[PDB]
Design a protein around this nucleic acid. Structure first.
Lengths: 84, 146
RNA sequence: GUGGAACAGUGGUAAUUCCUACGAUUAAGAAACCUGUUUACAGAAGGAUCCCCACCUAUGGGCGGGUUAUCAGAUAUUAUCAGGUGGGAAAUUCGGUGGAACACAGUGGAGCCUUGUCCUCCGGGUUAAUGUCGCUUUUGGCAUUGGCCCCUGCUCCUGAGAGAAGAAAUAUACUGGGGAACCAGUCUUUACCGACCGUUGUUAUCAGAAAUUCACGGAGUUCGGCCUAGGUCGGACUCCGAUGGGAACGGCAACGGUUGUUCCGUUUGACUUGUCGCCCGCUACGGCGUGAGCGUCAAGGUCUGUUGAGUGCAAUCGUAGGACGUCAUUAGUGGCGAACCCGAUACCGAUUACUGCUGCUGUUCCAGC
């Protein structure tokens, strides 16, 4: 067996929240700051999981007919200023 | 800059020159009647000696000089009558026009040459030739089943 | 000192000029080549109006059976098509990352010892205590002990990259060269004090006293003994000794005390196949048949599982027209858009080959007074 058992007295039970985000069609999971890395390191060691860049996130928002704030939002103040 | 050579696939087709005997009208039947067989005295050196003589008598000497720099027959088998000629990318026009004007072999006459596939690599030409022969087997199997 | 022309060195920067059209297939992936048009639906799932026949009620209507017309956003088309294609170095026999999670030396185990010492940088300054020696509220000098104070230049995981040397100089620490911005090596950087670590071997032959602070000769100072017109002896320091590139703890090569050294193993995979175990049915000593189920293990069976280029006997095209730039003309057009090099998983930094632009520096030639 390859596991470590749970003990109610001396194991750090974390809170974990997984929610669906509707228009961007993606599942976001939220967690405390120092807890994210023990979760993140075990994610892509599953051999069918890769990491995203924000250029790739812009490609995903472009593919799903969605919108993006630094580029596809010219109407707002900060988007117009930054982009232009 | 490396050796950018182009390979040319050619196939020997024998038209059914027979006016006294009637003919059948179908797709795979005329594929059988054109893709019959190669004759006995057909090899690599015979096709090379014939194509160099056609290159001499048709295109000349300096055209044969430009053509015969990297003019080789890389792969050929008489069971299927398909061959691959290596050539330069500039004189590929000259090699295809020399393959067009192939009138007859010195032993057997009454034949045409079909240049089919040209590419700069032999690995994609073999992949296209396997798919083309697979389509030929599909047409043969469709006319054989019905 | 200035302006023009030419050359040289370094730093930064860019490279198919851009656009348009075309390049055979019901054998539906053949211009050379690659990718794309798969999260299946017309609120047509008991769909809507309507035809005939029979039934019940009447001011509307509903049910049952049969053939069955019309309708599903531009009354249409189910069988077409689009986009892209080698770069600043892909090169150079360079280096590192995608294994380490912020030093948690990425983790574990074994062996050895000096057994992993919360230790100590040396050094410099202040303060307190003690003891000695000279002035006499008291101060000064020496030695010990305790406490405090003394510098991450910047980004980055790594590799590496570039900035400045007013705390002693004119050349901006030292040394050598460069024509000058400067280059290389040893170094440090808010240092309001400085700091070239130790060991070993080498500098052959001659020369010289000596090739590594061996020793020797001379002069000066201080101390001790014999001794007292101050003569001699020993020890310590400083300076010098004709030579040779040399006497300068200077130059060269190898090894770390850093938080103990060393060894061993992976955290690296996806499909296909084979075995084993788990639930269902038959049978009951281990058995057998299906889940297009899961976990482990093995196999040079495969890796276009390949990248807004992805080949691997190595694709990265041809032509025509238009727009722009440069150069030469006899009537107004013609030529040119270069060179280096072509990767083979991707990225970054450095070096090297060439063109053009830009700033600086140096040189030569010519004048304005």
């Amino acid at each position: 067996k390859t596991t470590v058992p749970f003990k109610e007295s001396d194991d750090p039970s974390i809170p974990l929240v997984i929610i669906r985000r509707l228009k961007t069609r993606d599942w976001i999971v939220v967690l405390p700051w120092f807890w994210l890395l023990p979760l993140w390191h075990l994610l892509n060691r599953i051999p069918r999981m890769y990491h995203i860049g924000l250029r790739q996130f812009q490609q995903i928002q472009y593919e799903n007919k969605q919108l993006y704030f630094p580029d596809d939002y010219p109407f707002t103040q900060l988007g117009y200023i930054e982009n232009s | 800059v490396r050796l950018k050579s182009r390979y040319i696939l050619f196939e020997i087709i024998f038209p059914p020159t027979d006016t006294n005997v009637e003919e059948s009208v179908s797709k795979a039947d005329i594929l059988l009647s054109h893709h019959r067989a190669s004759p006995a005295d057909v090899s690599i050196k015979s096709i090379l000696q014939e194509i160099r003589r056609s290159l001499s008598l048709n295109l000349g000497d300096y055209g044969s000089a430009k053509c015969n720099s990297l003019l080789q027959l890389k792969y050929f088998s008489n069971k299927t009558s398909t061959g691959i000629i290596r050539c330069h990318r500039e004189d590929c026009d000259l090699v295809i026009m020399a393959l067009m004007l192939m009138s007859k072999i010195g032993d057997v006459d009454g034949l045409i040459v079909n240049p089919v596939k040209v590419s700069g690599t032999i690995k994609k030409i073999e992949q296209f030739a396997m798919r083309r022969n697979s389509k030929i087997l599909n047409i043969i199997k469709c006319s054989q089943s019905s």
